[PDB]
Write a protein that binds this ligand. Structure first.
Ligand SMILES: *[C@@H]1O[C@H](CO)[C@@H](O[C@@H]2O[C@H](CO)[C@@H](O)[C@H](O)[C@H]2NC(C)=O)[C@H](O)[C@H]1NC(C)=O
Ligand SMILES: *[C@@H]1O[C@H](CO)[C@@H](O)[C@H](O)[C@H]1NC(C)=O
Ligand SMILES: C[C@]12C[C@@H]3C[C@](C)(C1)C[C@@](N)(C3)C2
Lengths: 415, 425, 132, 79, 43
């Protein structure tokens, strides 16, 4: 039993059995080790995705079946060179066939024989969604250096020609100071000349300055309305994973053990496993619950169930990195005892569903969610210091330039 | 080996006189493995169809090299004669049915391994037993997108010519009204008192003493503020709203669901997409329109789409997406359907089946396929979304820069007029 | 509509800009001393709030450049403030909207979601008769 | 807007009380009105020291208010 | 009302937040005037 593929639920107490569109799945219960009673069994009935696909294949091939849940063990890890769980049971000829979530790799394929995959998945990660937007230097986004230097040179030229007009106590510093103060919302208080043509020129400059400012605010606001949300971690080769201890208090991320994900990550990267050695978690539900309370920063598991779980949780506060980039993409399958004639038959029968298109409707019915991955990007708010540090950096640079220029001028006038 | 080049999995280029082609260094300068192919020259039938030697390379040849080195066997590749994937077709009105294309090449003695973008379906799985796929994909649709509206002029965009005139008349009207009020109970000063407050700039010290005139100015200041705010809001609202596009949703689009005389689309001849469309009974209504307009190969179809002759193209998702991010005059849309990966084709009796099927998973689990994907697929190019928040270019600056100089020359002319007026008095 | 002064900004920004105003006033006083003491703060505050108050611009050159950049800062601050206010003002989450009968909310009901109709009506006949 | 008007009235009365301890009620209302719409109109300064503190908060109010009006307006037009 | 986007005009929730500040400034004005005259007369 596994949540998005095979679901088990109690039978109807009044009728004595459960609803239709389902098949019974007998369940074995454990007993006291002192004296085991006669093997007890409890009638349960299982419904889901793989169960329905099995029901379709069985009618297509016209054979009967009787399925039962596994007593002990997950999908299976090797101990003492011997298997447990479903993959262990299929070897001992008691089951002869398996169905459900079972990732395909080389170790399991070296024991039993598989069928062509009918779903795509792999290794993926998810992180909580940070509130705000990545806008480091948004004030530089509007305009470009070309217009910034062009307006400098234009104001220099107009100030020079204004001084030339004044030739035929308007000084040179006051002339440029007036225009520079006036271009920025007429904030600075200055003194004005007594020349009519100079008045016309400064009125034209004021027209230009006003047109400027409104465009700049609208361009910046528009731009903000269109902001892109980018995940913090680029991928599995990011420095935030390989070098975990040097950035900040170390991240809180872990994997569920006794799984194919741990086996895949062990051989590729051992030090990561050494770090995981203390941050394991009980199960999918516990990890999903703990993600929201800040106890964990990242989570690694099979992408097939995470993609479903993202769109089913209340709200859309949980996302996945990038475009759902799967790592080491493999597919689920149907385990079959080695060297059996039914393998080719069932493999050819399952491919028949590709052409008919029934599986597409089936999976749209059984797997469609609510949330979207199309960059919702709700809003940035509160304008944290990190969002606008560059302006204060420029202010500090201007202060340093002012002090060094004052020292240089004092030295020049000292001699 | 028998293999074709679609877009990215095999590349075909002529060789030099020496009998090979000079190596092309990678982004880091690493060598690019090649191999001497023996394939037909040209594409169109009726040419001097005599074989020539040439060199090949791509995302698939290096995988073949790895497979050969791991399993320790030699090889000698050669391309296909007809350049078609191949499917069943009854010929000569006889009882027996025989394939053509790669299907015939592998099924009768000609080849041993098909290492190419081969799709897995029920028909080809009957006569060939495949291997585990190395790259999943689907089917998408290719369309063309239209350039949106420009940034326009500084003044023309949010105001059409009919205004400006009325505000220019009204400012002088209210100036005249103020001058008349002053005269009844400084005429030049009123013009500045009006123009400066409109222009948000301080000029002069115009301080009328009339009660009614002060009321009128206090009223007009709010009007000026409203005009400025309305202009800003207009430009801001226009600078963010985008023109909606068609962006055909997919196989459920009504345009694809019934034939139209102003919407033509096609697919390459005699391939798996044709089998998928023909096999199903309900999809005949558009297959019937498709069968009269099919083309020869994808190397010709994508060239025709740019030249405005096809409104759609149904083909592989991977190849289309690779050529959707390389040339940004074309955009891919829709959702994947008929999801089934590729594979390596074999006859039904060979240990190479098992050995290759194990080795391909071995190489797939340890990230080598991701390295190949980064090397040959994900270099990417111009892909500036669809809304594309546009930084305003010279378009805005040119007009105001020209005005500044026009104002300067008008100012020197008015200076000459000023000496004229001084002489006149 | 939230708090007018707290919706787009945190307090830390207010304290930081106030400290910047004070330190730039001190810097203006230092530049004036090196080459009015009570007028620097008035100048800074008038530039910050665009008030009609004002006594006199500094006479030094580097003081003029410093005043220019200080005047430049406030325009960026106020423009960002407006822009942030708007975005906030126009984007509202569309959550909790059932599309209809094809919504996966209804096709796979959960315990936290409850819905029912009136017994012995056309709805009961329509639902019971259909076999899916 | 009636709250605006009564605010101008009460602030003018407070300013007169300040001046008790060529400023007049004619120019005080002119200044208070002008600072609302970006202080475009030239005005006569208040010589009193505390009058500057009295009007600085008014200018702060004016700029906050003004910005909000533009901003809101953009949204309204956009929808 | 109708529609979905619902662009709503602002109300007294915005007004009172700044009316409190302006009223506080006005009421503190007299105390600051008293402090000012005391400091001017004492020195
Ligand atoms: C992973 O598998 C190991 C297999 O040894 C589990 O360890 C045993 O779990 C059972 C379950 O109750 C305990 O009774 C044993 O005492 C455990 N053995 C040891 C040596 O600790 C482990 O619990 C499994 N973990 C998960 C998350 O399934
Ligand atoms: C493996 O088997 C040996 C005996 O054959 C036993 O002592 C040991 O505990 C086993 N290991 C595990 C992990 O059960
Ligand atoms: C250009 C503008 C746009 C909006 C914010 C500013 C600060 C700048 C004041 C204004 N009156 C309204 C004019």
């Amino acid at each position: 039993e596994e949540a998005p593929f095979v679901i088990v639920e109690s039978v109807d107490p009044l009728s004595g059995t459960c609803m239709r569109n389902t098949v019974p799945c007998q369940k074995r219960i454990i007993s006291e080790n002192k004296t085991d009673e006669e093997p007890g069994y409890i009638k349960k009935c299982c419904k889901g995705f793989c169960i329905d696909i099995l029901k379709k294949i069985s009618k297509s091939v016209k054979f009967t079946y009787d399925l039962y849940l596994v007593t002990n063990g997950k999908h299976g890890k090797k101990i003492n060179g011997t298997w447990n769980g479903m993959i262990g049971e299929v070897v001992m000829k008691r089951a002869y066939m398996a169905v459900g979530s079972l990732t395909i790799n080389e170790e399991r394929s070296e024991v039993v024989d598989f069928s062509v995959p009918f779903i795509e998945t792999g290794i993926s990660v998810m992180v909580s969604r940070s509130n705000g937007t990545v806008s480091p230097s948004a004030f530089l986004e509007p305009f470009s250096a070309d217009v910034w230097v062009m307006m400098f040179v234009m104001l220099l030229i107009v100030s020079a020609v204004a001084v030339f007009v004044f030739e035929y106590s308007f000084t040179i510093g006051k002339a440029i100071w007036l225009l520079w103060g006036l271009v920025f919302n007429n904030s600075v208080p200055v003194q004005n000349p007594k020349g009519t043509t100079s008045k016309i020129m400064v009125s034209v400059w004021a027209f230009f300055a006003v047109i400027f400012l409104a465009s700049y605010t609208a361009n910046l606001a528009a731009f903000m309305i269109q902001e892109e949300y980018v995940d913090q971690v680029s991928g599995l080769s990011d420095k935030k994973f390989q070098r975990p201890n040097d950035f900040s208090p170390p991240f809180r991320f872990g994997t569920v053990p006794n799984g194919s994900t741990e086996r895949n990550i062990r051989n590729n990267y051992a030090e990561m496993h050494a770090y995981m050695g203390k941050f394991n978690q009980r199960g999918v539900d516990d990890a999903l619950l703990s993600l929201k309370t800040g106890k964990l920063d990242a989570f690694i598991y099979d992408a097939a169930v995470l993609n479903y779980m993202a769109g089913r949780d209340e709200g859309c506060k949980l996302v996945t990195i990038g475009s759902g980039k799967v790592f080491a993409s493999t597919g689920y399958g149907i385990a079959i005892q080695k060297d059996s004639g039914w393998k080719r038959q069932v493999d050819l029968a399952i491919l028949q569903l590709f052409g008919d298109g029934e599986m597409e409707e089936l999976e749209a019915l059984w797997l469609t969610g609510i949330c979207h991955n199309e960059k919702n990007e709700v809003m940035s708010s509160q304008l944290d210091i990190d969002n606008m540090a560059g302006v204060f950096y420029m202010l500090g640079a201007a202060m340093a330039l002012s002090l060094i220029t004052f020292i240089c001028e004092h030295l020049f006038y000292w001699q | 080996i028998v293999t074709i080049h679609q877009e990215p999995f095999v590349y075909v280029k002529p060789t030099m006189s020496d009998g090979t082609c000079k190596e092309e260094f990678t982004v880091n300068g690493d060598p690019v493995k090649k191999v001497i192919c023996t394939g037909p020259n040209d594409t169109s039938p009726g040419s001097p169809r005599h074989t020539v030697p040439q060199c090949c390379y791509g995302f698939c040849i290096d995988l073949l090299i790895k497979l050969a080195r791991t399993m320790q066997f030699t090889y000698e590749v050669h391309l296909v004669a007809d350049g078609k994937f191949g499917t069943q077709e009854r010929v000569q009105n006889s009882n027996k049915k025989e394939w053509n294309g790669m299907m015939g090449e592998l099924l009768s003695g000609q080849a041993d391994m098909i290492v190419a973008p081969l799709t897995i379906n029920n028909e080809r799985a009957q006569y060939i037993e495949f291997s585990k796929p190395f790259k999943y994909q689907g089917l998408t649709i290719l369309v063309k997108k239209e350039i949106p509206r420009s940034t326009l002029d500084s003044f023309m965009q949010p105001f059409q010519s009919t205004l400006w005139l009325l505000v220019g008349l009204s400012v002088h009207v209210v100036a005249v009204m103020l001058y008349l009020l002053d005269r009844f109970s400084t005429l030049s000063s009123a013009m500045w008192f009006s123009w400066g407050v409109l222009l948000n700039s301080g000029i002069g010290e115009g301080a009328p003493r009339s009660f009614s005139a002060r009321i009128l100015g206090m009223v007009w200041a709010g009007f000026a503020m409203i005009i400025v705010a309305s202009y800003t809001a207009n430009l801001a609202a226009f600078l963010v709203l985008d023109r909606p596009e068609e962006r055909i949703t997919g196989i459920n689009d009504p345009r694809l669901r019934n034939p139209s005389d102003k919407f033509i689309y096609a697919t390459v001849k005699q391939s798996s997409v044709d089998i998928y469309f023909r096999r199903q009974v309900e999809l005949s209504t558009m297959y019937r329109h498709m069968e009269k307009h099919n083309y020869e190969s994808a190397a010709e179809a994508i060239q025709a789409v740019r030249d405005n002759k096809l409104h759609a193209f149904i083909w592989d998702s991977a190849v289309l997406e690779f050529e959707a991010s390389q040339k940004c005059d074309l955009v891919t849309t829709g959702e994947l359907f008929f999801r089934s990966g590729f594979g390596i084709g074999m006859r039904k009796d060979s240990p190479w089946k098992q050995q290759v099927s194990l080795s391909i998973l071995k190489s797939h689990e340890n990230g080598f396929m991701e390295d190949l994907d980064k090397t040959w697929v994900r270099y990417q190019e111009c892909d500036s979304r669809s809304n594309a928040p546009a930084t305003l270019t010279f378009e805005n600056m040119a007009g105001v820069f020209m005005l500044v100089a026009g104002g300067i020359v008008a100012g020197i002319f008015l200076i000459f007029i000023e000496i004229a007026y001084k002489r006149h008095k």
